[PDB]
Amino acid sequence: AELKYISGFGNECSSEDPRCPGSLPEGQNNPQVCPYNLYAEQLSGSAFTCPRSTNKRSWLYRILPSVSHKPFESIDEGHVTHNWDEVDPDPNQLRWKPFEIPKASQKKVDFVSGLHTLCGAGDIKSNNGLAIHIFLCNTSMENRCFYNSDGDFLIVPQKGNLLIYTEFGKMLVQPNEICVIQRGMRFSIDVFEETRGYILEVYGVHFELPDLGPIGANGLANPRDFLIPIAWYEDRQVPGGYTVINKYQGKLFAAKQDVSPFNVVAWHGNYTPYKYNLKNFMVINSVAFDHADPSIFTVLTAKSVRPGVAIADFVIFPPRWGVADKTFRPPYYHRNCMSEFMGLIRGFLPGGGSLHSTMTPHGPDADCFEKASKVKLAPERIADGTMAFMFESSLSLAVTKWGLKASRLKSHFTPNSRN
Template identity: 60%
Template sequence: MVHCAGVVTEGDLQYLSGFNNEFASEALPDALPEGQNTPQVCPYGLYAEQLSGSAFTEPRHENKRTWFYRIRPSVKHTPFTKYTRPEVGHPGTYPVPVLTTRWDDVDPNPNQIRWLPFKMPEDSEDVDFITGLSTVAGAGDCKARMGGMAIHVYTANRSMVDTAFNNSDGDMLIVPQQGALTVRTEVGVMRVPPNEICVVPRGVRFAVEIDDEKLVRGYVCEVFGVHYKIPDLGPIGANGLANPRDFLTPVAAYEDRECEFTIINKFQGAMFQAKMQHSPFDVVAWHGNYVPFKYDLDKFMVINATLFDHADPSIFTVLTAPSGIPGVAVCDFVIFPPRWAVQEHTFRPPYYHRNCMSEFMGLIKGEYEAKKGAFLPGGGSLHSIMTPHGPDAKTYDIASTEALDPVKVAEGTQAFMFESSFSLALTRWGEETCETVDSDYFQCWQGLESNFDPSWKKT
């Protein structure tokens, strides 16, 4: 039987309002103990259990943990055994998904890579969020917990049933592109449609449900050993970019249900499973600051150049997973939302660029302003460290001659980027098996001709 604090709807969320504040939620009155975390007997006969997302001795402002008060402790399960995902898909139709952290399966490839929209499951396939996860690229060691990341895509046509996922390796930033997700977690339920994102921290068990078994697709950025946070603003001041008050976390919602339930655990890059005879979503009350959260990308306060030149894309950072070096990220989540372009005497699209960071881009909807008509929703691109990239020839020609009147850029569009200081390695799935690699991507720059005129004089 499912219980919750009222009916679980999209509105059953509370403001996160910061990333280190204490939050509390209870689905039954007085389910949270008063004055201490572990009374001899918890209210309603519940078990107290702490989930720690940081070392006990980290500075207070960095310390992350949440106390659960649950019907049964999560330790009540059978031993973990190796889990092999069902081999859905077959060459020529839906590609067999591969989830991996092995970065040496294929030789390094510095070329610009673009993927057409990643293929959806066939009607004959039963694919849920976990069986449909495929790793595109990544770097770093999930065992060392000193930083690293993996980029996955997901496609699915059914909900997870009596199954939950536990990622022991990293936080998962989920970016829906097609179809809404209902993400059921130990602390409550979030509905996440396209143009919203959610983050499930390492170790929080969750299941993904989809509406009426519709097709869904999206992107996932997993970071090892660090957590996502909102970036510091520096000279921008106190306001701008993603405002803390717009992040939402679930309220307590529990189910007291006895059934055979499977916990799928990603541990050191490998997959394991354990059985329990009850639902893991039995947390009646909780308090802490280590919780899943969601964010609506339409609420991003855009900062932009207002006189000349093209500002660096860092001004569009929604979340960052920092490394141990100040200002250098394991991963920045950057968006390119609708905004006004007003610069004078300026080439307004993104400038041609070689970068000491890796840049994976995806498109949620619309047309990306630097690759109109060719970079499609549900696809992606990877521009590796120091590999040049920039607008295609058609975009360059238009932007070099158009009248520089104020114009709304990217209306109806939402592109994003996972930008990392790591040199990302492609997986075999990402380079070969997924079958949507655009082998003609390089052609989009071949029309860039020399305009050099040694006799040119400034007028």
Template identity: 60%
Template sequence: MEGSLKYLKGFGNEFASEDSRCTGALPDGQNTPQKCPYGLYAEQLSGTAFTAPRSVNRRTWFYRIKPSVCHGPYKSFGDSGLTHEFTKIDPNPLRWGAFDLPLSENVNFIQGMNTVCGAGNLNTRNGLAIHVYLCNSSMINSAFYNSDGDFLIVPQHGKIHITTEFGKMNVIPDEICVIQQGMKFSVNVEGTARGYILEVFDNHFELPNLGPIGANGLAEPRDFWTPVAVYDDRDVYYTIHTKYQGHLFSFNQNHSPFNVVAWRGNYVPYKYNLNKFMVINSVSVDHCDPSIFTVLTCPSSKSGTAIADFVVFPPRWSVQENTFRPPYYHRNCMSEFMGLIKGKYEAKDNGFQPGGASLHTIMTAHGPDFSCFERASNVQLKPEKIAEGTMAFMFESSLCMGLTRWAASSCKLDKDYYKCWDGLKKHFHQS
């Protein structure tokens, strides 16, 4: 079951849901009554400091069968593909082919996460990390929560079924979901699944300000969805994993963590269909900067500068006159990590594969390859639909990202990526 959420910047509104099997499970009045309906326990999940301003304060009250405190001791989970050791520094333009899906051994979502790159410090809660997930097995009687930050999950191949404390979400390619810090969830798959994860340590994601665009455009609040409550009352052996300070720990308990009968608050998981994005584009002389494609942003303390932006490049009409229509050649004070969900990205004719990725870090030059430049420089300019059948995205950050050992040594790393610009010719003439 899935229900609608009117997603407003700052989550100024409060939302509520209760399992239809237990009408009246939400207390009428005080959040922690002396006795909750149905003999439930009240438990708060805080997503901001208690003293955060009201406009940005986030928390949710759970009314659950047993509280989260009922579990065994934490133990180190051992080695995993998750890391925050971004030790490999490389200013070269980088590109990876499609990351391999597991074919034989059973690999679930937790086991299939591998960190590609990132920046910052978990101790001071500043920075981000980018991961990929590659799995072919469901999480059975196990769950995960992130103590370090928020996950923005971008499926590229295969549907994922996510159970959370708030309810269930089905997320398919062309959709994204956000699981915020501390929220427990479990992932089931059908066959194989591959996708990307943007993790932020600082703040939470929010809708970008629209500025001169006005009241309408980009991602609309009404198009974001959050689960409805559905409890799981099973007394079974469960393993809960957490990522804490970049390392995995786990503990055991004798009941399902998804035993929430009702909840209310403004700190929730949510999903969004990228095909709902309202593209803003130039209709006159030149095209705008890629910031007009921002779906969600995680702001830094510096005004107008993001720890991370999630930017999407969907199918759209191109009608500009007398200009070079593909993305322009560029050197950026931000780091740009790109992924391709499907199709063919308009600035790259070959090599950029669905399920692969590229990274152009701070001030590393990038732009259309040779064949794209030649075609775009000579084509007849007329209104055309571009990126049909394509969905590309970008994780952009003000931080300079380093690579993990896994990403730097991957057989999918294209050592000849720089050659895609070799054919660019000198056209200069004095006349």
């Protein structure tokens, strides 16, 4: 059966499992005894003193508070790392073939076990950084959940659907859709095949919709298309213990508890997981001449404190009309102060990627330059049946050891002839 959702990016939402009407306290957050005898638990996504525009928190009315668990124990990190200095810097463009997914025949690997950090920058405990990870897995998480104490996750499936269980409800996230799981939120993922995808992790900050500037009040990723799960719970005891995996200061820890963490009967707040279908992106671009800068395709942004400068932006290159006359339509040659990671949902193949590091020259190849400089221009369809994206950062990304192991024009100048 298919899941229902609440819509509205950043909304102050209220949701009760349909089986327990009125589980949300009426007119208050902390009754002496909560309806149905539940426990009230607050998840604070921002400092308490943040202004209305940035204050984030959710109240969870659950069967047992999250404190009921045994002590965390250190587990092996696998390929999740934040040591940006084990590998010497390298300005050259890097390219990756679609990352290899392990076969279930060979090794049963769930989403957490198949998490591999590709590159990143910044300090984790300081709320200034990011990391890009690739998930390669083939089995559903069983009696195991995961939460990130360090920051937020923008998850981008490429091959394989994700059925995601969160304390706020469930989300089905398919390729060409994305979802965000914010700091502290426990989640579990069921897969249905050899699965591969990308994850943009930002330290201590949250994603927002970009101010539209001249675009105005509508356009790009409309708020209404962001979908939030409806409350759903399970009161399930787990023989042998349910395991909660914790990414804390970049290391992984495991804590056993008696029941599943998804026992939230009702919740309200503006700090929740969410998903978005990329096909709903209202594409804005040039309709007369010239080529628009790629920031015009920004979906979500994790703002730095410097005005207009992002820690990390999520940008997409969707199906659209190309109509610019007397214009070089392909991407212009470019040297940029930002790092540019590029992925492909559906030259690399879907599931691979490239990294253009800061100020390293890039641009179209000889064949693309030649073809675009000669074609009679007319309205054409671009990117149909494809979906490329970019994670761009203001920091200088550094590839990890694993990231490295996994990796791979003529002059026409007529001095005397202007026209």
